[PDB]
Amino acid sequence: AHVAPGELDEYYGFWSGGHQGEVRVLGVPSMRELMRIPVFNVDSATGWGITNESKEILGGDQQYLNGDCHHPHISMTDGRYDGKYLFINDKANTRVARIRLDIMKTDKITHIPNVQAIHGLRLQKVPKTNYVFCNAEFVIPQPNDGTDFSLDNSYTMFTAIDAETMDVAWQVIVDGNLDNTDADYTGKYATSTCYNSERAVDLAGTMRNDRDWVVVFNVERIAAAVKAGNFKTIGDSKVPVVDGRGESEFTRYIPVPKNPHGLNTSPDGKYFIANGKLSPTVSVIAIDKLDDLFEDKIELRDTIVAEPELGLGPLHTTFDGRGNAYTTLFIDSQVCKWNIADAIKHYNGDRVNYIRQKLDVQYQPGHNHASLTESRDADGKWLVVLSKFSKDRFLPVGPLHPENDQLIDISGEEMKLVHDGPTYAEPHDCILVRRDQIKTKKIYERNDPYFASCRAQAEKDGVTLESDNKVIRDGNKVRVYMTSVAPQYGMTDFKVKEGDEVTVYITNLDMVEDVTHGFCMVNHGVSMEISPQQTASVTFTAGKPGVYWYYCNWFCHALHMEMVGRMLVEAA
C-alpha cells in the first residue's frame, strides 16, 4: 500500500481526464501521477494541438480546444490485456481516440458521423480487440441538416470502429438513446444501457417510464448484414448503417428499472450487469441465455437472472473475480459488496443475504474499478472508487473543489479504505494494468510513424534530418530544419520576412534516456517536445519585423539557459 523512494508501483493506472481532455497515468498503490497523455486538450508543454504532427492526428475541419473523455480501455487478446492500445471517448465534440501504449501518445483520432456526444465506450474481448464499441448519448435528426428539429424524428446510433485502422466499420440505429456499454467474452454480443427511451429533453420526460432497457447487439449478425451489402448510408458519410429499431434481428431490448447507467461484464463472462440509478437495484443479464433470446425461444425478461436491491443510486459495478460484485451508491454515498450467486438464489425465492458489506465512500461515488476486472485475470486486490465531491477531504482551495478517488483494499473479506486521492477536472472511469502488461520504449526509432510526415517533407527538400541544418525557402513558406545535442541547436540564427509561414523541424540526436529537448519561439505561441531521436515540427506566422529569440524549454543540461537562437524577421 506504500511506495518508498527507490521502489516501484505494481500497476499502471490509466485515469480518464473528464472534460479536462487528457488521460492521466498514475502508479498504483502510491496513487501518484506519473504522466499526462494529451488527447483532446491542448498541451502547452509537449505542444499537442500545436505541433503539426498532433494537428494531423486531430484532423477535423475545425480546431477544438476542448474535449470530454470518460472511458479509457486497453486492447485485449482472448479476454486478457495485451497492452498495445488504449481507447477513449470525447463526449464534447463527438470523437474517439487511440493511444499508443509503447510511447504513451495519442495515435489516432476519429470523428463519428451523424451522431452526437460519444459517451459509453468499451472494447471487444474475444478473440481480440477488432472492434471498438461507442455510444452516442444524444438523439438528433437523421440527417442533422436543420430541416426538421422534432424529437420525434431524432435518433442516435451504436458505432463500431475497426481497432487497428480506427476507421468506422458500421453503425446501428436504435430506439431511445445510449449510455454505457460492454461486450462479452465470445465476440458475438455487446450491450448498452438506455435512460431516455422516451427520447425527450426535459427532465420529466426522461423519467417518465418505469423502465428503460439494455440494448443487446448481435455483432455476428450485424457484421454479416454489412458484408452482404444490406445497409444504407446517412448524409455525406459512407459508413454502413443497419436499422436496429423495434423488431430487428440485430437488437434485443431487455427492459430495465429506471434510467439505468453503468453496464458491466463479469470476469467469468456470463453476466452483463446494468445499474439501476433511479431504481435502487441492479439488473443481472445472463449472456448464456442470449442465443435463445435472438431465436425467440424465451422471453425478454427471462434473461434476467437477478435484480437485487442494494441501495440508493447504483451507478457502476466491478468484480473481484471471486464471485463478488462491488457497486457504487451515488445517493447513499457508499460502495456495496454483494455476492452474485446469493443474488441469483434470493431472486428465485430464497432468503439468503447477498449484501456482504457497505463502506461509506467520501461523497457521491461515480465509477468503480477493481484491478484487472475487465479481463479473465481479475485479481481482486484493489478497488478504486471515484467520487464527485471532496467537500472537507482536503485543504480548502476555493469554490472549485477537487474530486476524490479513494483506493480500497479488497484482497480480504472486508473492504478497507487505504488512500484518499485528490484529483482535478472530474475523472470518470479508470483502468489498472499490471506493470508487466505494458512494454514501453525509451528512445525513438527514426522510421517511427509519429513523424513520418516530417521525413516525407524532408525527402522532398533533400534534407537528412539526422545531420542537416538548413533553411528552405518556398515562396511565402519557410521550412527550417535544425538538429539538437548537448546544450545546442545546430542552428542559432535564421532570417525570414514578416508574414512568412514558418515551420521549424527539430531533430533530437541525443540517445541518452530522459534527455528531452524542447523548442519555443518567444511571442509566437509555439512550443513542442522533442524526446530522444524524435523529430517534431511546428508552424507559425512570423510577427512584425524584429528579433525573436527561441529556446529549449526542457531542462536538459547545465547549459540549458544557453540553449538558444534568434529568428530575425525583416520588413517584407
DSSP, collapsed to helix, strand or coil, labels residue 115 as coil
Binding-site string for a second copy from residue 81 to residue 120, where x marks contact by CB under 8 A and - marks none: ----------xxxx-------xxxx----------xx---
Nearest C-alpha neighbor of 365 from the set 308, 410, 318: 318
Q: Does 488 contact a second copy by CB under 8 A?
A: yes
Nearer to ligand CUZ, 70 or 252 (CB): 70
DSSP per residue over 248-308, as a string?
A: -SSEEEEEEESS---EEE-TTS-EEEEE-TTSSBEEEEEGGGHHHHTTTSS-GGGGEEE--
Q: Does 554 contact ligand CUA by CB under 6 A?
A: yes
> CA–CA separation, 363 vs 562, rounded Å?
50
- Minimum distance from CB of 68 to ligand CUA (Å)? 12
- Minimum distance from CB of 415 to a second copy (Å)? 13
Please choose which of a second copy, ligand CUZ, Ca ion, none residue 429 contacts, taking the beta carbon within 5 to 8 angstroms, the exact cut-off set by kind: ligand CUZ
Q: Across the strands, what pairs with 189?
A: 218
Please choose which of ligand CUA, Cl ion, ligand CUZ, none residue 552 contacts, taking the beta carbon within 5 to 8 angstroms, the exact cut-off set by kind: ligand CUA
Q: Does 311 contact a second copy by CB under 8 A?
A: no
The residues in 255-284 that bind a second copy, with binding defined as CB under 8 A, are 259, 261, 277-278
Using CB under 8 A, pick the residue from 529, 535, 536, 537 that binds a second copy. Answer: 529
> CA–CA separation, 247 vs 371, rounded Å?
38
Binding-site string for Ca ion from residue 432 to residue 471, where x marks contact by CB under 5 A and - marks none: ----------------------------------------
Report the relative pairing of strands 477-485 and 501-508 from DSSP bridges: parallel
The residues in 384-403 that bind Ca ion, with binding defined as CB under 5 A, are 388, 403
Nearer to Cl ion, 240 or 260 (CB): 260
Category of 277 on φ-ψ map: left (φ > 0), alpha (ψ -120 to 50) or beta = left
Binding-site string for ligand CUA from residue 506 to residue 535, where x marks contact by CB under 6 A and - marks none: -----------x------------------
Please choose which of a second copy, Ca ion, ligand CUA, none residue 517 contacts, taking the beta carbon within 5 to 8 angstroms, the exact cut-off set by kind: ligand CUA
Hey, what amino acid is at 443?
I
Using CB under 5 A, pick the residue from 110, 180, 196, 527 that binds Cl ion. Answer: 180
Contact 257, 304 (CB under 8 A): no
Contact 173, 161 (CB under 8 A): no
Residue linked to cell 459517451 = 119
DSSP, collapsed to helix, strand or coil, labels residue 241 as strand
Sequence-distant (≥ 6) Cβ neighbours of residue 547 within 8 angstroms: 566, 567, 568, 569
Q: Does 552 contact ligand CUA by CB under 6 A?
A: yes
Nearer to ligand CUA, 213 or 444 (CB): 444
Nearer to ligand CUA, 444 or 554 (CB): 554
Nearer to ligand CUZ, 90 or 342 (CB): 90
In degrees and rounded to multiples of 5, residue 300 shows phi and psi of -50, -60
- What's the Cα-to-Cα distance from 342 to each of 303, 345, 347, 349, 523, rounded to whole Å? 17, 5, 8, 11, 66
Binding-site string for a second copy from residue 450 to residue 479, where x marks contact by CB under 8 A and - marks none: ------------------------------
Per CB under 6 A, residues contacting ligand CUA are 517, 552, 554-557, 560, 563
